Structure 1
């Protein structure tokens, strides 16, 4: 299923995630494409932060959904 991860920096990411795909694997996809380190990725939804060990369907995340991405660069 397609999803749209938009960051406040002004960048959107389009990935084909799976219903039972863990948040951890979602970050992995971004890492594969944009090359953004999953450990530096902060997926925010509804105003809170998502848990790496959780699934998309855990937060009612479906197709065409929008996830907020924040770059957490450590030491800078």
Structure 2
């Protein structure tokens, strides 16, 4: 299915993913589309932070879902 991700700049990206895909796989998809490191990518939905070990389906995320992207600063 396809999903949308909005960044802090109000930019929304459309990606192709499945419900069984893990959040870490979604971050890697955004990187290949823009070029940001998956370690600094954060997915937020319905006020809940998605865990790299959890899959989109775990957060009831269905096609055309709108996720939020945040920048993580903890890697030197």
Fold-level similarity (TM above 0.5):
yes
CA offsets 1:23-43 (integer angstroms, 9 cap, x no match): 110001011111111100011
CA shift in 2, pair 1:68/1:62, >3 Å = same
For these two proteins, the number of residue pairs brought into alignment is 76
Moved over 4 A (4+): none
CA offsets 1:4-51 (integer angstroms, 9 cap, x no match): 000132211110001210111000101111111110001111112110
Question: Where does the alignment leave 5 or more consecutive residues of structure 1 unmatched?
Answer: none
TM-score scaled to structure 1, two decimals?
Answer: 0.90
Question: Where does the alignment leave 5 or more consecutive residues of structure 2 unmatched?
Answer: none
